């Protein structure tokens, strides 16, 4: 039996740190996909 | 996050491993050092 908080497992990521990296990463893709273009992110499509 | 004790990784059939229960609350801190990414095939390549 579970003794404690009744909760589902969870993963924490700091909003500031992930974003800062994202801003730096998204610029590297534009060294290939071109100076100016729209890059949208989305979760997994589907599968196992 | 979801928890699964019985796993078949690497598309293994014939052998399934059961992850044994752990006493107390588990806490872990790791570094995220990189990603595995895929690009969509729908194009509209010159758009986004």
């Amino acid at each position: 039996d579970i003794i404690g908080d009744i909760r589902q497992a969870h993963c924490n990521v700091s909003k500031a740190t992930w974003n800062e990296t994202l801003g730096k990463v998204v610029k590297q893709l534009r060294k290939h996909f071109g100076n100016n273009t729209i890059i949208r992110f989305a979760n997994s499509s589907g599968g196992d | 996050c979801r928890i699964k004790q019985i796993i078949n990784m690497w598309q293994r059939i014939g052998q399934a491993m059961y992850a044994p229960p752990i006493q107390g609350v588990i806490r872990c801190v790791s570094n995220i050092t990189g990603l595995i990414l895929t690009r969509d095939g729908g194009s509209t390549n010159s758009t986004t």
Epitope: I2, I3, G4, D5, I6, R7 | V25, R27
Partner: antibody, heavy 134, light 103 residues
Framework: PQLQESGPTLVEASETLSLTCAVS??????????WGWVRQPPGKGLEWVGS?????????????YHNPSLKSRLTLALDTPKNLVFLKLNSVTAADTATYYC?????????????????????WGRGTLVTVSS | LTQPPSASGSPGQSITISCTGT????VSWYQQHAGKAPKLVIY???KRPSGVPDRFSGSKSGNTASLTVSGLQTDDEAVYYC??????????FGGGTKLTVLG
Amino acid sequence: PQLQESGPTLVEASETLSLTCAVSGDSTAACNSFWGWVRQPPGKGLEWVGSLSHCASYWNRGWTYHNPSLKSRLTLALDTPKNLVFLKLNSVTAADTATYYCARFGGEVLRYTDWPKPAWVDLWGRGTLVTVSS
Amino acid sequence: LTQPPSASGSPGQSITISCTGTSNNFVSWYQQHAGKAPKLVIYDVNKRPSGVPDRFSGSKSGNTASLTVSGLQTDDEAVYYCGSLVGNWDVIFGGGTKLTVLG
């Protein structure tokens, strides 16, 4: 399950009141209930003192609850191996004179959300009278 | 919590004592005989504990909580306190209701 209170029945004013509860038939390690005290001044109503529990979560080494008014002058402690409860009151006055009962707190202790929520005392002790005089 | 100061009834009659200030369901009632230790006669509103007669029933309507004792008897003469959890983890008690089954 029996709760036996022990300590000085006569304490001088401004001194430190110390009381110790000895549990029998149950373990203080059990996460099903909180352990604390409830004092009842002579011919008066029931007042909540506080309770604690070593059964913790990932961000703490336990839980300890103090009554906002009595918080400053009290200290709560639990001995898990020896199965004992402790209460220490600093700077005690004749106003703190009461019949002290050893209390077991039931509630949302065994399955809580966020913090644990103890709401009612299921098991009581016989209690002793402590008179504070200067 | 506001509990009525006194309450009286004849043997066999049913008494209902109230309590107010409870916004939650953590309400519980206690019975303390004079010169003795208090005993919990009810918890989580209506729910009864072990070795407690059916005639004791808890009830809460709106901001008002109520305890009901039917079929009064000599041993029912005592002081009855109510209590409930409030806010995060603090708990408070009412003034208590004194119920007497004296002659």
